[PDB]
Design a protein around this ligand. Structure first.
Ligand code: HEM
Ligand SMILES: CSc1ccc(C(=O)O)cc1
Ligand SMILES: [Cl-]
Length: 393
């Protein structure tokens, strides 16, 4: 009853161009079985949305990667938020919500925006730049570690550590196994910066530790919640901003609309998140036998959600393969949906908005002028190198 496919969604060929195989996965049926990894797959918007919004049946505490924590030991202590179910999830989630809340966004917005404007002014002096290293990476590195409260020394560990985290959600392929082989120094640095004395006053990390006396979290939970932000909040934004720049470079008509109304910056970024989906795939594990899209899934089965595919499903979106900065993007699953929906989404949107605003006001054209190189990761989509010429407005 369930179609069985041999598509490997963690293969280099799939990463290089996932869109045809994602259509094959959607069109095969609402629920597929992936024989390569012995998991169920859902690639349509409807089933991805349903799975995300039934956390009792499709749990996270057995891992959101391929590995089932009931069968294998996790590669690092489980996240207290991502890898927890209600009720254990609820209070750590509330703490991170308040740490990354509107009031916090108000305190950091002016500095984030000034840093975005400054970076674009600097890039315009060079003209020809790499929109990954020099923009998508450089900008978040200039604001997020400081907003966390991290010291200057050792920040070179942050991107490798986060890359490791996202490779580790994948199956035990060469990408995952090489990442884990190289992890020790990055884990050591990251774990150390999570301790209270190492986080500067007023930053996100200090705020997490300050919440350890309200009865929501205890002091011993705070380091792992700082670890969550370092794991989840840097390389995702890098790829989101890189995706937005790539879209503007490939769809010049939309750059022109954005220049004509810079208030479209926030939605231009949201549309880039839908269109490229930096976080491509995530898993759940069934806690009972369940009927989903007409199929019967047994207990203890891994279910792979194709977030990027759901964000391009023509059953849900008109012209899903077009980048449209005025699209009604509400409901896309690029940040998830339901109780785990990205707790850092306001930080991501602030960074993307102020960078796209700076581009909208300062740049007249973005022209690819060199070889584009993709970066391969088991669950993140994004580029390694994006040579562009920026023409000033
Ligand atoms: C464009 C940038 C980002 C994207 C595409 C993204 C994507 C996602 C997605 C899809 C989830 C849901 C995971 C699931 O349902 O299992 C999530 C959760 C989460 N995100 Fe983000 N994220 C981004 C930025 C950030 C930032 C900036 C932070 C922190 C500053 C952050 C921290 C987290 C955390 C801690 C969770 C777990 C929330 C929970 O389990 O309740 N993310 N993110
Ligand atoms: C959705 S990506 C991500 C989210 C949370 C964590 C974490 O809690 O460590 C890591 C990655
Ligand atoms: Cl770790």
């Amino acid at each position: 009853t369930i179609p069985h496919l041999a598509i490997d969604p963690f293969s280099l060929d799939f990463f290089d161009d996932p869109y045809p195989d994602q259509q094959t996965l959607r069109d095969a049926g609402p629920v597929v079985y992936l024989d390569k990894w012995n998991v169920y797959g859902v690639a349509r918007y409807a089933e991805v949305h349903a799975v995300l919004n039934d956390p009792t049946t499709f749990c996270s505490s057995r891992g959101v990667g391929l590995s089932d924590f009931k069968k294998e030991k996790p590669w690092r202590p489980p996240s207290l938020i991502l890898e927890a179910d209600p009720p254990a999830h609820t209070r750590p989630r509330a703490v991170l919500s308040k740490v990354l809340s509107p009031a916090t966004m108000k305190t950091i917005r002016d500095g984030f925006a000034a840093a975005a404007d400054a970076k674009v002014d600097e890039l315009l002096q060079r003209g020809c730049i790499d929109a990954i290293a020099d923009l998508a990476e450089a900008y978040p590195l200039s604001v997020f570690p400081d907003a966390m409260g991290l010291k200057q020394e050792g920040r070179e560990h942050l991107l490798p550590y986060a890359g490791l985290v996202f490779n580790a959600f994948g199956p035990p392929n060469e990408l995952r196994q090489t990442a884990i082989e190289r992890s020790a120094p990055h884990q050591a640095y990251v774990n150390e910066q999570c301790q209270r004395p190492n986080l500067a006053p007023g930053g996100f990390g200090a705020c997490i530790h300050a919440f350890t006396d309200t009865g929501e979290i205890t002091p011993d939970e705070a380091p792992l919640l700082v670890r969550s932000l370092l794991s989840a909040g840097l390389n995702t934004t890098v790829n989101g901003i890189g995706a937005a720049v790539y879209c503007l470079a490939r769809f010049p008509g939309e750059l022109q609309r954005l220049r004509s109304d810079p208030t479209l910056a926030r939605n231009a970024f949201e549309e880039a998140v839908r269109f490229e989906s930096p976080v491509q795939t995530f898993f759940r594990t069934t806690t009972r036998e369940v009927e989903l899209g007409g199929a019967v899934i047994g207990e203890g089965e891994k279910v792979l959600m194709f977030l990027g595919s759901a964000n391009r499903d023509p059953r849900r979106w008109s012209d899903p393969d077009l980048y449209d900065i005025t699209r009604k993007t509400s409901g896309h699953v690029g940040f998830g949906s339901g109780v785990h929906m990205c707790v850092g989404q306001l930080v991501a949107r602030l960074e993307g908005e102020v960078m796209l605003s700076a581009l909208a006001r300062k740049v007249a054209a973005i022209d690819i002028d060199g070889p584009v190189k993709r970066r391969f990761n088991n669950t993140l989509r994004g580029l390694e190198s994006l040579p562009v010429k920026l023409t000033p407005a």
